Write a protein that binds this ligand. Structure first.
Ligand SMILES: Nc1ncnc2c1ncn2[C@@H]1O[C@H](COP(=O)(O)OP(=O)(O)O)[C@@H](O)[C@H]1O
Ligand SMILES: Nc1ncnc2c1ncn2[C@@H]1O[C@H](COP(=O)(O)OS(=O)(=O)O)[C@@H](O)[C@H]1O
Ligand SMILES: Nc1ncnc2c1ncn2[C@@H]1O[C@H](COP(=O)(O)OS(=O)(=O)O)[C@@H](O)[C@H]1O
Lengths: 182, 208
């Protein structure tokens, strides 16, 4: 198995983690590959527990996550990352770290702010509108959309399985996965 | 939720091994510069992958200190942070169901204890932590000094490299490591056998 990184980027509540979970599930079970998810839960309370949400801390959050994803890819696993990663320069630095190589598949999990705001599972968009949370991506901090993602998922009014199929189909056009199991 | 040890749990041997073998573990090598940690790690990975068919990945200065930890030096605070970050990365590999093998001096007992604790804790939502096997790769400093192609000990004694472990900074020897290897006047394969034999007493590996 050749490793690679599948880098999800998009607004808070765009559906990145949900997509990552289903993607990992299909990859492991249907293609028999090794995959591991890096997300807020296993990174921001551990390796990056010293970081907040200032621009500088987000630059460092992503810098570290990209180096860790590269280690997983180097280990021959598929690293699936699910972080807002709002700054294009940091995503490009992450891509270069891999390519200079290991494949880096950037997946833009795209929903308009309106859709994420109506989901608002943890009520953070409402807090951001009220000024309780400062510098909140999409409301009071920037989201720099990817210019050239390998996969662009219009992730609204869309079954998670259709979104995952879109990603797996892309990986197959590049031959990154073993043939599907019978 | 409140954690307890496997001993305190009353789970049987088959139950303990089944539960702790659901994911991976970390083999944490500690010892002086040039004590032989990375050498043992390469041979250990070779035997584990070859003879036992398990997945393992090595973390060492070459893949950590010029990437993730390129922002850190050798001050005490930077070594505390170097080890904290490595421990968290090794934990991710163990969580991913690989054997993480680390080869860092990790001179401070408090940092090795922090590394152990973050692995061993059963965090909310998981029922068990991840095993952490500390291996003291022990050689006298005189032996490490005879394994110094880059002359780091020489530079340390000359004052070119400040606070160098074993010469001008301390190495806090592990008091209770899982495995204590006296890695001199002993071929590497023998040291590795000592480590693998220990792993087998815990049942962490597929049958020989
Ligand atoms: N395709 C989808 N359609 C509608 N809701 C979704 C979809 N995918 C995820 N969600 C919902 O949106 C919320 C945010 O999803 P999540 O995966 O946690 O987002 P993110 O990781 O981008 O912050 C959740 O309540 C989730 O169940
Ligand atoms: N100011 C904030 N901006 C964006 N997300 C925030 C903020 N404060 C808390 N969060 C929470 O943290 C998650 C984003 O964390 P990351 O993906 O790690 O962000 S990133 O910008 O540094 O990539 C959101 O989904 C939300 O749960
Ligand atoms: N002051 C120093 N003390 C010990 N090793 C040093 C020092 N400066 C450079 N090194 C080099 O860095 C290696 C030790 O790096 P680490 O294992 O990452 O150290 S640790 O103390 O922070 O765990 C040594 O093998 C040596 O090549």
């Amino acid at each position: 198995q050749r490793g690679l990184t599948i880098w999800l980027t998009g607004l808070s509540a765009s559906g990145k983690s949900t997509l990552a979970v289903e993607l990992e599930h299909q990859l492991v079970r249907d293609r028999r590959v090794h995959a591991y998810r890096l997300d807020g839960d296993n990174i921001r309370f551990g390796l990056n527990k010293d970081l907040g949400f200032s621009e500088a801390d987000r630059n460092e959050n992503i810098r570290r996550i990209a180096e860790v994803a590269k280690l997983f890819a180097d280990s021959n696993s598929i690293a699936i990352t699910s972080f807002i990663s709002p700054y294009r320069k940091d995503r490009d630095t992450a891509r270069q770290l891999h390519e200079v190589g290991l494949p880096f598949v950037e997946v833009y999990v795209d929903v308009p702010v309106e859709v994420a705001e109506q989901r608002d599972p943890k009520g953070l968009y409402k807090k951001a509108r009220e000024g309780v949370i400062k510098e909140f991506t999409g409301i009071s901090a920037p989201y720099e959309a990817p210019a050239n993602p390998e996969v662009h998922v219009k992730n609204y009014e869309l079954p998670v399985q259709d979104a995952v199929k879109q990603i797996i189909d892309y990986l197959d056009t590049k031959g990154y996965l073993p043939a599907k199991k019978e």
